[PDB]
Amino acid sequence: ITGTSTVGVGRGVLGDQKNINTTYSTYYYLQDNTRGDGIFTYDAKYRTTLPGSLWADADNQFFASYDAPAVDAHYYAGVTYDYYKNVHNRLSYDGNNAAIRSSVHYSQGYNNAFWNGSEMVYGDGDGQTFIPLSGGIDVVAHELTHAVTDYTAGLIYQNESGAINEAISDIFGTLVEFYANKNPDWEIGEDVYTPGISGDSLRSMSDPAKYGDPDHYSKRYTGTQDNGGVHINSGIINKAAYLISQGGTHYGVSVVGIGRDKLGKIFYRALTQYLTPTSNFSQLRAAAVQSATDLYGSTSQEVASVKQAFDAVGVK
Ligand SMILES: CC(C)C[C@H]1CCOCCP(=O)([O-])N[C@@H](CC(C)C)C(=O)N1
Ligand SMILES: [Ca+2]
Numbered sequence: 001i002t003g004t005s006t007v008g009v010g011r012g013v014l015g016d017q018k019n020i021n022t023t024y025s026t027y028y029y030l031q032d033n034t035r036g037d038g039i040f041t042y043d044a045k046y047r048t049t050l051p052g053s054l055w056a057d058a059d060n061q062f063f064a065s066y067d068a069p070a071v072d073a074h075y076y077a078g079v080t081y082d083y084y085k086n087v088h089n090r091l092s093y094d095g096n097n098a099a100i101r102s103s104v105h106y107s108q109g110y111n112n113a114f115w116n117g118s119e120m121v122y123g124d125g126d127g128q129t130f131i132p133l134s135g136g137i138d139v140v141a142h143e144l145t146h147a148v149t150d151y152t153a154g155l156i157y158q159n160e161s162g163a164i165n166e167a168i169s170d171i172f173g174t175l176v177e178f179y180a181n182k183n184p185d186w187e188i189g190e191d192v193y194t195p196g197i198s199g200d201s202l203r204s205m206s207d208p209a210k211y212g213d214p215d216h217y218s219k220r221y222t223g224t225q226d227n228g229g230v231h232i233n234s235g236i237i238n239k240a241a242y243l244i245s246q247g248g249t250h251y252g253v254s255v256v257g258i259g260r261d262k263l264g265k266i267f268y269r270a271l272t273q274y275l276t277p278t279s280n281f282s283q284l285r286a287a288a289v290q291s292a293t294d295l296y297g298s299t300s301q302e303v304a305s306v307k308q309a310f311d312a313v314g315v316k
């Protein structure tokens, strides 16, 4: 749409009020012209045909409950765009300011979110297992990071490369959650998962085994479900990433933490410069070491922590 840039206000899935960037042209649309070539949010009106209709509102106030998921998907995508640009100097997912699009209210009772190769899609949840998925900033950033990975390393979605792909999405979704300082943690999806139960989450990076995902290479899943366990085995990389950042002793191997910022610089460089579509865990380790080496010196502590972390999860 062509119109005047403005700012509206609404309430997100969790009931919090926020301002969002809109465009005015007869109606007010969820179209943010301030970032790259724009962020656009669409209503899929409970259908599965995408993208659906660009979200239009009559008065620039988004307090209706049907509005919530759109408010959050639109706002969280802007925060995520900000993280990448500010933190890594990357303009949108393709690095050339591509428009970011998301659709909400996809299908009925859909308990998932995904990147379909061209845009983000968020279900509303069935209200027991999940509430609308765009209310979790770590979920929004996990989705946009799949776009980043597809434009860069291109990790194929199966087996070890696919689990690397998935870990990348959880790691940067968590880093964006800390960037925005939105009650950050090392858990995934806590804010929209099982509304009835407090304290849980979908996956844990600090202790993946809490939910049954592997935290050591010897425990990897070798079957065929989930494309070869991309959502299970990512637990091994997530744990490594958490140790690089926070430090700890795991399986008797001690790691000194180097912090989130460095974790992000190292993984971003590995992703954008060294990983390839078919890279495996052992190649991710070489990539991460080389990146840390590039950035801090081969005799640095940084390099040392990256090695210890992988050794601790059993990746040689
Ligand atoms: C949400 C379900 C239980 C877990 C897996 C389902 C398969 O989803 C594939 C697409 P994705 O981008 O990996 N979606 C992720 C959504 C989370 C972060 C809420 C995911 O882990 N989905
Ligand atoms: Ca309105």
Ligand SMILES: [Ca+2]
Pocket (backbone or CB within 6 Å): 177, 182, 183, 184, 185, 190, 191
């Ligand atoms: Ca949190």
Ligand SMILES: [Ca+2]
Pocket (backbone or CB within 6 Å): 138, 174, 177, 184, 185, 186, 187, 188, 189, 190
């Ligand atoms: Ca989280």
Ligand SMILES: [Ca+2]
Pocket (backbone or CB within 6 Å): 190, 193, 194, 195, 196, 197, 198, 199, 200, 201
């Ligand atoms: Ca819960």
Ligand SMILES: [Zn+2]
Pocket (backbone or CB within 6 Å): 142, 146, 166, 169
């Ligand atoms: Zn994913």
